[PDB]
Design a protein around this ligand. Structure first.
Ligand SMILES: *[C@@H]1O[C@H](CO[C@@H]2O[C@@H](C)[C@@H](O)[C@@H](O)[C@@H]2O)[C@@H](O[C@@H]2O[C@H](CO)[C@@H](O[C@@H]3O[C@H](CO)[C@@H](O)[C@H](O)[C@@H]3O)[C@H](O)[C@H]2NC(C)=O)[C@H](O)[C@H]1NC(C)=O
Ligand SMILES: *[C@@H]1O[C@H](CO)[C@@H](O[C@@H]2O[C@H](CO)[C@@H](O)[C@H](O)[C@H]2NC(C)=O)[C@H](O)[C@H]1NC(C)=O
Ligand SMILES: *[C@@H]1O[C@H](CO)[C@@H](O[C@@H]2O[C@H](CO)[C@@H](O)[C@H](O)[C@H]2NC(C)=O)[C@H](O)[C@H]1NC(C)=O
Ligand SMILES: *[C@@H]1O[C@H](CO)[C@@H](O[C@@H]2O[C@H](CO)[C@@H](O)[C@H](O)[C@H]2NC(C)=O)[C@H](O)[C@H]1NC(C)=O
Ligand SMILES: *[C@@H]1O[C@H](CO)[C@@H](O[C@@H]2O[C@H](CO)[C@@H](O)[C@H](O)[C@H]2NC(C)=O)[C@H](O)[C@H]1NC(C)=O
Ligand code: NAG
Ligand code: NAG
Lengths: 297, 327, 65
């Protein structure tokens, strides 16, 4: 790879612009091939595509390592002072080597760990104690049952089964990944991975501001929770839910209580007024694939 | 006289004429407290305590005499420089000396014990007896002051008092309430230091600091042996160094004074790790032999109601009494 | 009921992840910290009993990936 190695630029403005342009071109090629590999991974064929994604990530990370080392050794004394926001932002983006600080063995271990995490989460499945021939998955089946059924026992079975089958074989991998990411981002210059993640928003009082926002928004969620708790108590009785206390996780709409939209069946107030839907329009005029996109146009 | 041996505490005679060290023979005076009130007045001090014959009372007497060392030493400083550096120093310096007294070697060499019981079994017994109150308290103090910080700073609104308190208890100390509580109860109030305005992290800081003080003094005491029987008795240089440290009360940051004495400006648990080394090794061997988890593999476990309806609490369920009744 | 019921979860997941990364959550308080956070912020009680063996964050897709 000729574009992998950067030339001998200078800390001056012209050298900085040349470095920025060279990075622009090289990264254009790198993310072009990366997006090609990632898109081909999850369209028709998955065999020999996860491995291709891993090698592409490895080579892109090596490219980032080399370019970040060059950027460090060529701009570190003048990194803070640049008199140009664009130059500061681009040099900060390039300087963040990220997961390239680990040695070769550690880098391979970290990439393999990420791939193992993704595959373990994707292929995880849960089904019945008997007739264990074929059974459900996460999105095609589990979401449908957990969002459409109204039986407490079956909801509990689905929720517990998925949570066990997707959390139990995932703990040691997460421990190792946390250790590796902490080491890499400590060598980067940040106090920890969480500090780097907060560094995107660029605010020293990020946690305080978020806590203030949530304390402002608390009454809304408290009232909504009380109303939904009363509705669920009416539906399921005063044995699986009490008025004073929390709500069981599966009783809500989605699997992880992310959204309650599926609970609107037995929460809606004043049901005499008709619900809002335009399915009849699709029944009248066909909406095959593009009508909802020409409407966006 | 133990103080004076290492050229320490030239006790003024006013204590032997105007300080009460006894139980109140007449009058409804103080029953029993744990303070050493100083006359101050730029000149003198005093002790107000109780007198008994038990070794615990002797240890408490040594503790409060160590408290009196502090006052005797920091009086030339102004009226605002009376608290001794870190607020946890007063217990620490008042306790490290006790750590020297309670050693059987000290009792034997001062004439209280016939001979030194140089036995490993006795060593482990005494170490576990003392580690049942200088270690089980370590999660506490930290727990209480963390909860109080949370409530003060706003992270614990009045709708979450007991929730935060009991989550902290199950986290650090690992003790769950036998009765299922809720937010109406205020379980932090049972402790005396919560309603009364009293900081509670000073005791944790002292329980960490006293063993570091013991290790530093022992290293300067010339005895490079076990940390158990390493009393400061008959160590003029150790007394001189302790006097030098005690000379300044809050006149300098506590980190600087600690660096001056021990050798570093930050708290370390390493001397505490070395102190409890044999009991820790024996504990590890016992835990491995018994084959049990180290701790907390299953939480959300609350004990079932023992038929706590208050009609059978008076029923006795002791093994020894049952066997005696059987016989 | 689509947005407000989500807001605490958004404030919750990455707070737990920060706790795990920064070291305040050793690999013996994963599930405990997660479920305490759930009962504190979202007011959600896990139905079945959960020990430290379970990892009730890998169910969410954004935790493993
Ligand atoms: C990432 O995962 C790979 C692939 O293994 C797959 O994912 C794991 C998390 C498990 O669920 C595996 O069952 C699953 O196939 C791991 O590489 C694998 O390493 C092992 C150990 O060298 C290889 O052989 C195994 O060894 C023993 C017996 O010797 C048994 O566990 C198995 O029967 C098997 O023979 C295994 O072939 C290999 N798989 C490859 C290279 O594709 C890898 O260790 C893991 N990475 C990390 C960091 O955990
Ligand atoms: C999907 O629906 C679209 C939108 O109706 C179809 O596109 C039009 O189809 C009509 C059918 O009468 C034709 O007269 C138009 O010429 C088509 N184009 C446009 C721009 O309006 C489309 O054929 C349908 N099928 C597919 C496969 O896209
Ligand atoms: C009590 O017995 C212990 C052994 O259980 C003695 O251990 C001493 O340990 C120090 C550690 O630095 C060694 O330097 C000594 O040589 C050991 N003494 C021995 C082996 O006799 C300890 O000295 C004993 N204490 C008393 C007061 O006799
Ligand atoms: C952990 O919690 C589970 C329930 O979530 C407890 O129940 C057993 O879980 C194991 C898997 O860890 C299953 O194989 C058993 O069938 C479950 N039931 C019984 C009766 O054993 C499990 O005991 C808990 N473990 C710990 C160590 O607390
Ligand atoms: C607890 O049970 C043990 C074992 O059963 C008791 O020990 C025996 O008690 C019986 C009572 O009839 C005696 O006949 C045996 O000789 C005892 N065996 C011994 C002492 O080895 C024991 O007494 C019971 N009580 C306690 C407090 O342990
Ligand atoms: C950059 O300098 C190095 C010094 O070793 C030299 O080998 C290399 O050819 C130079 N590259 C360019 C593009 O001038
Ligand atoms: C940073 O750069 C500016 C550019 O105007 C300059 O004035 C300032 O002295 C520099 N600060 C340094 C070099 O510390």
């Amino acid at each position: 790879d000729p574009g992998l190695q950067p030339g001998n630029f200078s800390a001056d403005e012209a050298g900085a612009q040349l470095f920025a342009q060279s990075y622009n071109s090289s990264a254009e090629q790198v993310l072009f091939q990366s997006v090609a590999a990632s898109w081909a991974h999850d369209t028709n064929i998955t065999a020999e595509n996860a491995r291709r994604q891993e090698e592409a990530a490895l080579l892109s990370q090596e490219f980032a390592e080399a370019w970040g080392q060059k950027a460090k050794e060529l701009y570190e004394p003048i990194w803070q002072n640049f008199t140009d926001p664009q130059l500061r932002r681009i040099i900060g983006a390039v300087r963040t080597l990220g997961s390239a600080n680990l040695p070769l063995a550690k880098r391979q271990q970290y990439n393999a760990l990420l791939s193992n995490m993704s595959r373990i989460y994707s292929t995880a499945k849960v089904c019945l104690p008997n007739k264990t021939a074929t059974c459900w998955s996460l999105d095609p089946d589990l979401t449908n049952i957990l969002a459409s059924s109204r039986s407490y026992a079956m909801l509990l079975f689905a929720w517990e089964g998925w949570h066990n089958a997707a959390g139990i074989p995932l703990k040691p991998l997460y421990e190792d990944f946390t250790a590796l990411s902490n080491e890499a981002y400590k060598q980067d210059g940040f106090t920890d991975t969480g500090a780097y993640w907060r560094s995107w928003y660029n605010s020293p009082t990020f946690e305080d501001d978020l806590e203030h926002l949530y304390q402002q928004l608390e009454p809304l969620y408290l009232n909504l929770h009380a109303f939904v708790r009363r509705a669920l108590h009416r539906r399921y009785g005063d044995r699986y839910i009490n008025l004073r206390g929390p709500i069981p996780a599966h009783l809500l709409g989605d699997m992880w209580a992310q959204s309650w939209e599926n609970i609107y069946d037995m929460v809606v107030p004043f049901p005499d007024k008709p619900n809002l839907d335009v399915t009849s329009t699709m029944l009248q005029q066909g909406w095959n694939a593009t009508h909802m996109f020409r409407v966006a146009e | 006289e133990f103080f004076t041996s290492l050229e320490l505490s030239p006790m003024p005679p006013e204590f032997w004429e105007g300080s009460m060290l006894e139980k109140p023979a007449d009058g409804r005076e103080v029953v029993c407290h744990a303070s050493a009130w100083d006359f101050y007045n730029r000149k003198d001090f005093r002790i107000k305590q109780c007198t008994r014959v038990t070794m615990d009372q002797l240890s408490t007497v040594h503790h409060e005499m160590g408290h009196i060392q502090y006052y005797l030493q920091y009086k030339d400083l102004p009226v605002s420089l009376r608290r001794g550096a870190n607020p946890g120093f007063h217990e620490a310096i008042g306790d490290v000396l006790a750590l020297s007294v309670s050693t059987p070697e000290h009792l034997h060499k001062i004439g209280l014990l016939d001979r030194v019981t140089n036995d490993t079994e006795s060593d482990i017994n005494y170490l576990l007896k003392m580690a049942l109150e200088k270690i089980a308290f370590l999660p506490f103090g930290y727990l209480v002051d963390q909860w109080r910080w949370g409530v003060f700073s706003g992270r614990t609104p009045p709708s979450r008092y007991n929730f935060d308190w009991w989550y902290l208890r199950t986290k650090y100390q690992g003790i769950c309430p036998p009765v299922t509580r809720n937010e109406t109860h205020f379980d932090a109030g049972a402790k005396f230091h919560v309603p009364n305005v009293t900081p509670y992290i000073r005791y944790f800081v002292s329980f960490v600091l006293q063993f570091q003080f013991h290790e530093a003094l022992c290293k300067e005491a010339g005895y490079e042996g076990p940390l158990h029987q390493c009393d400061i008795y008959r160590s003029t240089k150790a007394g001189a160094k302790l006097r030098k440290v005690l000379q300044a009360g809050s006149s300098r940051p506590w980190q600087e004074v600690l660096k001056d004495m021990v050798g570093l400006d930050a708290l370390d648990a390493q001397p505490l790790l070395k102190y409890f080394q044999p009991v820790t090794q024996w504990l590890q061997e016992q835990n491995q032999q018994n084959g049990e988890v180290l701790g907390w593999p299953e939480y959300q476990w609350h004990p079932p109601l023992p038929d706590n309806y208050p009609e059978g609490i008076d029923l006795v369920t002791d093994e020894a009494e049952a066997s005696k009744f059987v016989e």
